[PDB]
Amino acid sequence: AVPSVQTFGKKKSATAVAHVKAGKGLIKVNGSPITLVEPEILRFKVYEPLLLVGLDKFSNIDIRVRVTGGGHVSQVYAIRQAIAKGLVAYHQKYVDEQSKNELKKAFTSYDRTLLIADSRRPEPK
Amino acid sequence: FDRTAKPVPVITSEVTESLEDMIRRRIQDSNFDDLQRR
């Protein structure tokens, strides 16, 4: 019944599903808040989808992320990818396309690996 | 008693000179087998 949006963030074998919907503004990773995501030195790697665009985008929506697999740093990279492209997809579908591609421009100017992973490797020289 | 399979051959001077003068004969008469270009 609610406007909701589901995205995916992947690094090596971690995978994070982020559901974004309209709400009061709560960002929850694995049930716990976002301010508990260990190893606590990469908590700003998790935070930078919020601090790159401002918390006034997150003031009206609530995100929840479920992260399985991987290790510590692969899980924080999956979390930040899921949060970033979930915010982009929510502003695409339920807010205007101008804020959509402003968010895409800001995340892509920081690093496009917030939005597109580096996936299939190696190179056979 | 009995055993499953013939064990691995211990390489001797006579068998190495056997395949050695075999390939002497072979590369003398140049009757070897490679690929050919298409």
Place this chain on the structure above:
Amino acid sequence: DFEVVEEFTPVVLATPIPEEVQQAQTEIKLFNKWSFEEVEVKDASLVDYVQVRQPIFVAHTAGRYANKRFRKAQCPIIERLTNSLMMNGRNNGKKLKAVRIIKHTLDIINVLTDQNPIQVVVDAITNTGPREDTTRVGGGGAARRQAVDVSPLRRVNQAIALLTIGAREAAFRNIKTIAETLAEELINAAKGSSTSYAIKKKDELERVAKSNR
């Protein structure tokens, strides 16, 4: 005069976010402490090789810099310092330990010399990197050296190498750790005191090049 309103309600979230964390949406600082603006590279020819113009939050950009030739000239120089810090057989792979001791050494660089530690480490790079060197012109192995110049990417490479391995040998079996020896090394290399391993090694390389020029 003229002022723009662009938020129209004080932004409050349901998950409480710390005040310094939500203060970090106006400027990106390294570890939320050290600002990247007014951090210039005070020696030209090394600007465009020591990169301080995209600010980061932690020295763990997992981007790929080793698949084109001069692509590591735009890895941020804090992260190049971190990656060069995590090398020997004992400490291979341990980038989180390297990031944590880089955080500790920037804190104690600032508490000793009360100035910007990113500016201190950038000055240390641009003072450490040797501006001349010798190759061994062979002649089959005739032991004679000929002085060559040295490109700025090699100067930044050898600067980070000299600083980090000087911090290792200075922390080898003394009371100080790698963070404190690296802090002393970066401070002395920034001011250029000739008490550091790194710029003593630079002065030796440049003097040998001046000798068999």
Place this chain on the structure above:
Amino acid sequence: QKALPASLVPQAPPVLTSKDKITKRMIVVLAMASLETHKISDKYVLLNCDDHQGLLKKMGRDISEARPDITHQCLLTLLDSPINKAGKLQVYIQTSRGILIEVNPTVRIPRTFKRFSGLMVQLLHKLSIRSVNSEEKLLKVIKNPITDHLPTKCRKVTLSFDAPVIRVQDYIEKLDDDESICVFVGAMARGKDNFADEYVDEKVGLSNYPLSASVACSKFCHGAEDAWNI
């Protein structure tokens, strides 16, 4: 107006090694030493000019180049010099076969020759020699090149006979407060004084006469003692 030290009782000087690249010192490098070992069948020896007629000619080399006596009598002179007792010197040697040996200041090199020969056999084959009191390790084969072990601020000169002659006292007070001095002296019987071209920026000499090896060492040491007030 200036006070005394708080403790007048004389401490021993800190013995310096390659693990201290900070302190100003004097490195003396005995280059092209003749330290090779050989088998008899049952027995191992160090190659002399005198333990054989033609073991060296069976090995190909000539007998005039198998002289460990002169690096022995240089090592005695350097380690009985007062600068070694004061702790401002360490002695590196490098064999003509390219083997670098670090020599501690704390070592007591044996005074006769064949005791030193039996010491050099075990050093060359066990790569390490401990003390009788077995607490530290005081004669050891280390890894080439020597510039990995020399101090980071260190002027490296070499000694010869055909060079602009200097005086050691004013030459050493020319250099500054943290610069050491690495003096490559050749421990050959004869040869061209080019054994260390790739490490050295200054090739100097001490006399106008053909100077023996340990006499050149003792001349440079006594000049250093006068320059550093020892």
Place this chain on the structure above:
Amino acid sequence: PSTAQGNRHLVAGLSSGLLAIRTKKKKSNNFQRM
């Protein structure tokens, strides 16, 4: 010090080997809408 803003202290350490500290100290949303 001058800006103590809390529990304020006078401390004196003696030559006897001890330390003396003397301090001076310092319903419903429906009902509320009604």
Place this chain on the structure above:
Amino acid sequence: QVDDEYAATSGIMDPRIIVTTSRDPSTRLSQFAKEIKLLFPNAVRLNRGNYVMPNLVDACKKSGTTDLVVLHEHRGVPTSLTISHFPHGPTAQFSLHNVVMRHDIINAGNQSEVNPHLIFDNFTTALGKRVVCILKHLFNAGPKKDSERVITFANRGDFISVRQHVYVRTREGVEIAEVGPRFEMRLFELRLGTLENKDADVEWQLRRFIRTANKKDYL
């Protein structure tokens, strides 16, 4: 003649070979793998560590490599090699028994790297023709007729002796010299898909435990 999954590019195109080790190899296996990549030409070596075999196979067969040689060891001494031909082709996997390598023995100089000549001795059965085709379509087609290195795959009772020789042709005969690794390899399995799955249909694999095992060759 050339069989049904090699006939499209038999002599049209040069091969492209990857040579790679098992997982975290020992130093003698790395020396051995360098010897295999400069045994046969247009082969390069790839450092397998933390490579999954499905995405390794997929990266090879979309980069365009023809085939893969995976080497397995036992405390230095290499024990197996698997040859996987990539355009959904066959894998012949072999065990290696008497391995003597030049990096172990002697600095006898450098090798020759010419497109070599190839000798195949008494591969009489149809399985012999199959293993001849899979062993010689990892070599370069059409060498010069005065190429001075030859290699030999000689069957000696299901134990393929593998050697490499250089030669000149003198006035009274031909004088031979031994370069590179000698083996006796033996096929323990063929199957018809690539290395990724092991769900592929088996064309041949040796039956060790049947009671008529040691009565015949290429059983």
Place this chain on the structure above:
Amino acid sequence: HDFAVTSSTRVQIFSSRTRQVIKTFSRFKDVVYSASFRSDGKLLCAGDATGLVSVYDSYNPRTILLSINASTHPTHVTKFHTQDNKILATASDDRVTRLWDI
């Protein structure tokens, strides 16, 4: 809101709300004499009877930040500048005080 008490061979920081020792500095070799905080309250200098000024950071006794080796005589008073931050004045039983840039 905290104060450092210099007893013999240890310096204890007490809190001004519980009056118990929150933190303590015990790795001195002889009698520690003076212990003062910097004007920013971020680090703590302590002069010791062997003439070794050791400055730690406050609220972390395990990270000795630098050990100035002053005179061989006992150093009896060590305090940072009250205006400047990076200079430390140590007087000792050598009848000479020293200003050190840290």
Place this chain on the structure above:
Amino acid sequence: LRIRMSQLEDALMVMPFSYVLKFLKFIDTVMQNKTLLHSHLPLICKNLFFIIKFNHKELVSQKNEEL
């Protein structure tokens, strides 16, 4: 003449500007002997035009009426 056409554009690019100036002196002397000017016209044209086309920025900043 004896340098080859594949490495001629490298042979003319290696040489510095002092050698370019004396190359111009060489061309200036050689087009007075009109025998070996006319037997090497396209070679002189190719080399001279590549030389000043490559070194054009420095040549037009030289200040000497002799040149």
Place this chain on the structure above:
Amino acid sequence: RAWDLIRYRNFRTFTGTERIQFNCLAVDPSGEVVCAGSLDNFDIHVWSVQTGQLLDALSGHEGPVSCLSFSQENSVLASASWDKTIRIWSIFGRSQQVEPIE
């Protein structure tokens, strides 16, 4: 195939070895090499123009090569294909370098 627009002659014809149909091409600035991509082959075919031979077949796309273009200044090849990937090939001078941008 190549066309002289002076003598109006088709002087060169380049085919592959696989009997595919070509959908896009790209030439060198210094026109030594022509390059062409198909929509059924996933390879890029690299022909010399001076001789007529097939100089290379660049492989690495996992989808039909939709478009080719040579950079006019530094002469790097850019191909882009339906596997959602643009790819940059350094062909000239010992590199054989591939950079895939997803």
Place this chain on the structure above:
Amino acid sequence: TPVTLAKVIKVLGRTGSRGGVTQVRVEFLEDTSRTIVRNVKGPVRENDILVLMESEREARRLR
């Protein structure tokens, strides 16, 4: 000693230089028209600046 800065305008190719050392052609920054041939040690490309302790010396080959 006063030092000078010089931007690479051309990495010289097919010179017979010793490996690990590449000849290069640099123009100055105080007068951006005059060049000099130097030969550098690390990896170098065009329009990057390198630091000359002297500029009174043209570079020969190394070999």
Place this chain on the structure above:
Amino acid sequence: IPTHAPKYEENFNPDKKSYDPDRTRSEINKMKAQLKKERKFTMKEIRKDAK
């Protein structure tokens, strides 16, 4: 500088082992090496004549 005397054995031989001053631990090390080489040679020979 203090002056220590160097510990070394006279008439050194690397191929012989060091002279341990205990005749019941040097002996067990000698006979452990002896059983290892003779056991290895013995079972190598019996498995190759089994082959």
Place this chain on the structure above:
RNA sequence: UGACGGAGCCAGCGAGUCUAGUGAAACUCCGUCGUGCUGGCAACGAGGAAUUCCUAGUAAGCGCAAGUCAUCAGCUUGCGUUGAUUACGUCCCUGCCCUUUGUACACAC
């Protein structure tokens, strides 16, 4: 880069009525110590000369499973976790190879 003592946490392989699934370690945090070897007068404190291998999820660190007709358990093969430095130029040295009519159709050389 230690040693004690607590705590938080993160994988992917693997399921025969057969065996005699939950969970990893490195990591992260919080208290405590404090850096001159071994015996019933032996070795040893990161290993000489030489030598081998190596270019991105690569070197290296880390654990967990399996045990697939050959091989392997004095171990072998998988699987994930963490993850760099330096080349990415050059034929100067060492070698190996190719060509020496341009042929293939213009233009140009």
